[PDB]
Amino acid sequence: SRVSTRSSLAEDLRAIGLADGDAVLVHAALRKVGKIVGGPDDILDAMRDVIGPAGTVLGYADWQLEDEIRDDPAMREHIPAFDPLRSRSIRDNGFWPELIRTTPGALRSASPGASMAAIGGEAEWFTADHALDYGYGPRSPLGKLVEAKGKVLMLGAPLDTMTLLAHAEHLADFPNKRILRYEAPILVDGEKVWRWFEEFDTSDPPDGLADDYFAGIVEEFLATGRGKRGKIGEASSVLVPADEIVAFAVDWLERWGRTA
Amino acid sequence: SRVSTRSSLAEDLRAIGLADGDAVLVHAALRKVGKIVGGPDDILDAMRDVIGPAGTVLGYADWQLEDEIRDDPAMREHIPAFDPLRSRSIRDNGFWPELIRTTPGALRSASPGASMAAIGGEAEWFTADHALDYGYGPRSPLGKLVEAKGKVLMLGAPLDTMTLLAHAEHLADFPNKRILRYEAPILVDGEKVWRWFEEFDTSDPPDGLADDYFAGIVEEFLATGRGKRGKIGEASSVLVPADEIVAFAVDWLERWGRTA
Numbered sequence: 001s002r003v004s005t006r007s008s009l010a011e012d013l014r015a016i017g018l019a020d021g022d023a024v025l026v027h028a029a030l031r032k033v034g035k036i037v038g039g040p041d042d043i044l045d046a047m048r049d050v051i052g053p054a055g056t057v058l059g060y061a062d063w064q065l066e067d068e069i070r071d072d073p074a075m076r077e078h079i080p081a082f083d084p085l086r087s088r089s090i091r092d093n094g095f096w097p098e099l100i101r102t103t104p105g106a107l108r109s110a111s112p113g114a115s116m117a118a119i120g121g122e123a124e125w126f127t128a129d130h131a132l133d134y135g136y137g138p139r140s141p142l143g144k145l146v147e148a149k150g151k152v153l154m155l156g157a158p159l160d161t162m163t164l165l166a167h168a169e170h171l172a173d174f175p176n177k178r179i180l181r182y183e184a185p186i187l188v189d190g191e192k193v194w195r196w197f198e199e200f201d202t203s204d205p206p207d208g209l210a211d212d213y214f215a216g217i218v219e220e221f222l223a224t225g226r227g228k229r230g231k232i233g234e235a236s237s238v239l240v241p242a243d244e245i246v247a248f249a250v251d252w253l254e255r256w257g258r259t260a
Numbered sequence: 261s262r263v264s265t266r267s268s269l270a271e272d273l274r275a276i277g278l279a280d281g282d283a284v285l286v287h288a289a290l291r292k293v294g295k296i297v298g299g300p301d302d303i304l305d306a307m308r309d310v311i312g313p314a315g316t317v318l319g320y321a322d323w324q325l326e327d328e329i330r331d332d333p334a335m336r337e338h339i340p341a342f343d344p345l346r347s348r349s350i351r352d353n354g355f356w357p358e359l360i361r362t363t364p365g366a367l368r369s370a371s372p373g374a375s376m377a378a379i380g381g382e383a384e385w386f387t388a389d390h391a392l393d394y395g396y397g398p399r400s401p402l403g404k405l406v407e408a409k410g411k412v413l414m415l416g417a418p419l420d421t422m423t424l425l426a427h428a429e430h431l432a433d434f435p436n437k438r439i440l441r442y443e444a445p446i447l448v449d450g451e452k453v454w455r456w457f458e459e460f461d462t463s464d465p466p467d468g469l470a471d472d473y474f475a476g477i478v479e480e481f482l483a484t485g486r487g488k489r490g491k492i493g494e495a496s497s498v499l500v501p502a503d504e505i506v507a508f509a510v511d512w513l514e515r516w517g518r519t520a
């Protein structure tokens with residue numbers, strides 16, 4: 001029965017630990033926030049108020065081409081190329097990355113399935129030079145979030161949607177990492193070309209693990225007393241430092257893979 | 261029962277009457293088109309291929325401020341002012357105006373409740389200088405649609421959502437037109453100010469007619485033979501000359517006003 005404002009959301013964000021100059025990747029379930037006077041745009045505006053102009057807000061866009069269409073040779077010349085300026089975010093990830101992507105000023109990185117939207121003082125740097133292959137590795141917004149000592153805010157989102165952990169999956173040395181190869185269309189100086197891609201499998205976990213095991217790792221991280229929980233509006237939310245939870249998740253995975 | 265492509269939708273638009281250099285207002289129910297390979301963006305892409313670069317495609321954006329919150333004094337300072345670059349389309353008009361508005365190169369006119377989104381060769385003209393009061397009058401994208409001799413296409417949409425006919429309500433001489441007055445926040449060169457507004461009532465029909473009466477007027481115009489029906493992908497869709505349906509509607513309303 002409580003309605004949120006740009007001002008009250010800024011206090012909530014400061015209360016969970018958002019600070020001046022932060023860079024924050026956000027995963028959101030916006031319905032959990034509850035009634036907002038100015039719609040969910042008040043959340044992004046509140047965040048920009050807190051972190052200031054030097055800060056950056058990010059979201060995981062991906063794109064909408066499903067595998068079964070991509071793999072259907074009949075529709076091959078009817079599939080539109082991925083275009084960081086025009087391709088819309090995968091709807092599976094909710095409105096939040098679309099909200100960012102279509103805010104004037106936002107930029108969107110180049111590696112389609114891993115592509116990120118960002119707005120703020122380092123939006124250019126965070127989206128620049130996104131490797132097409134292994135796009136969850138060091139040459140990616142996720143690696144740059146670790147380098148920048150950014151944060152990840154789960155805004156009512158289930159903890160297994162923390163995509164930053166796919167970057168730990170990339171770094172961790174464990175046996176039998178599944179490698180995925182696929183063909184997708186992209187623009188090379190404004191013209192459509194089909195390109196072969198390669199990356200570590202993000203869609204399914206390492207064999208032996210439950211499909212939602214990212215959530216277990218996050219809770220085990222919060223159990224050490226690092227990170228913070230809080231209400232953003234009415235959404236139960238989590239804020240964690242990106243570098244710490246990736247080091248935690250790397251050795252969680254490296255230790256598990258040794259037992260096999 | 262089949263998939264539509266940017267090229268399949270292209271030939272469907274040419275058969276309804278879309279032609280080179282056209283400027284067309286679109287009201288859409290996109291779930292009625294069926295499955296499209298590259299999503300509803302393939303619709304707007306097709307149209308811009310049919311009409312060519314001099315063409316122009318429009319949508320009725322409006323905005324999301326709710327009367328209730330607007331008229332709550334306690335919420336006054338928390339209302340985001342209307343911003344033609346940022347305030348999102350009213351969701352009751354469907355995704356289509358948002359689809360246009362969030363396309364790079366697209367423009368949005370200044371008068372909030374009557375705001376229109378536009379992309380194409382004449383997008384700057386169709387959106388320039390939209391009057392804040394009586395925003396369905398002559399100083400309006402709908403007035404310019406008549407002057408440009410454009411078209412309207414109901415793309416699976418209920419024919420009573422044809423907003424151009426509100427422009428016929430502004431123009432037609434019939435007694436007891438209901439004037440609406442309200443205060444609303446608007447961005448004036450980046451700064452929010454509350455401004456009083458007035459216009460003819462678009463939210464309820466003139467006292468004496470059914471709510472969906474716009475619809476019966478449309479198909480009656482179709483009985484004259486001066487419209488064209490046809491299926492866009494899977495959607496039953498109507499295309500109509502703008503200048504003629506206004507005159508047909510104006511005379512309809514003025515003639516009916518005397519009987520009353």
Ligand SMILES: CC(C)(COP(=O)(O)OP(=O)(O)OC[C@H]1O[C@@H](n2cnc3c(N)ncnc32)[C@H](O)[C@@H]1OP(=O)(O)O)[C@@H](O)C(=O)NCCC(=O)NCCS
Nearest residue numbers: 027028029030031032039040060093094095157158161348
């Ligand atoms: C799946 C998931 C998104 C569902 O969350 P949800 O709250 O149900 O859906 P969304 O987050 O899209 O938010 C919905 C709110 O959009 C607002 N919204 C959407 N578009 C809007 C618009 N154009 N204008 C105003 N509001 C809009 C609404 O409040 C809509 O709610 P309503 O339609 O019920 O009114 C959530 O559980 C989740 O998993 N989030 C994280 C996803 C992620 O980042 N995944 C990474 C890869 S694993």
Ligand SMILES: CC(C)(COP(=O)(O)OP(=O)(O)OC[C@H]1O[C@@H](n2cnc3c(N)ncnc32)[C@H](O)[C@@H]1OP(=O)(O)O)[C@@H](O)C(=O)NCCC(=O)NCCS
Nearest residue numbers: 088287288289290291292299320353354355356417418421
């Ligand atoms: C109310 C009305 C809009 C409902 O239409 P609808 O087809 O059910 O809904 P929309 O037209 O918004 O289109 C829905 C399709 O959006 C696609 N779409 C929406 N957003 C998308 C996105 N971001 N990315 C990819 N696809 C998206 C989907 O196919 C969505 O369907 P799904 O959610 O079932 O998959 C329609 O009946 C109507 O009355 N239209 C006319 C509105 C108008 O012009 N009013 C004028 C003022 S009175």
Ligand SMILES: CN[C@@H]1[C@@H](O[C@H]2O[C@H](CO)[C@@H](N)[C@H](O)[C@H]2O)O[C@H]2C[C@@H](N)[C@@H](O[C@H]3[C@H](O)[C@@H](O)[C@H](N)C[C@@H]3N)O[C@@H]2[C@@H]1O
Nearest residue numbers: 062092113114158160161163166202203204211212213214
């Ligand atoms: C860990 N579980 C996740 C699942 O959870 C969601 O669906 C479940 C269905 O039972 C629900 N129980 C659960 O509540 C809900 O959150 O959603 C699927 C969606 C699917 N397109 C893919 O996305 C991945 C992309 O394929 C990949 O490209 C991207 N990099 C990462 C995406 N997560 O894999 C995830 C993953 O399997």
Ligand SMILES: CN[C@@H]1[C@@H](O[C@H]2O[C@H](CO)[C@@H](N)[C@H](O)[C@H]2O)O[C@H]2C[C@@H](N)[C@@H](O[C@H]3[C@H](O)[C@@H](O)[C@H](N)C[C@@H]3N)O[C@@H]2[C@@H]1O
Nearest residue numbers: 322350352373374418420421423426461462463464471472
């Ligand atoms: C006449 N019907 C319309 C309704 O759609 C539905 O109407 C009937 C129910 O009422 C249904 N039977 C019908 O299937 C369906 O089309 O949507 C509402 C949405 C509301 N924001 C307002 O928009 C108006 C704006 O408020 C106003 O600012 C603008 N100028 C004109 C808009 N129509 O009034 C319309 C109008 O009442």
Ligand SMILES: [Cl-]
Nearest residue numbers: 062066067113
């Ligand atoms: Cl995918």
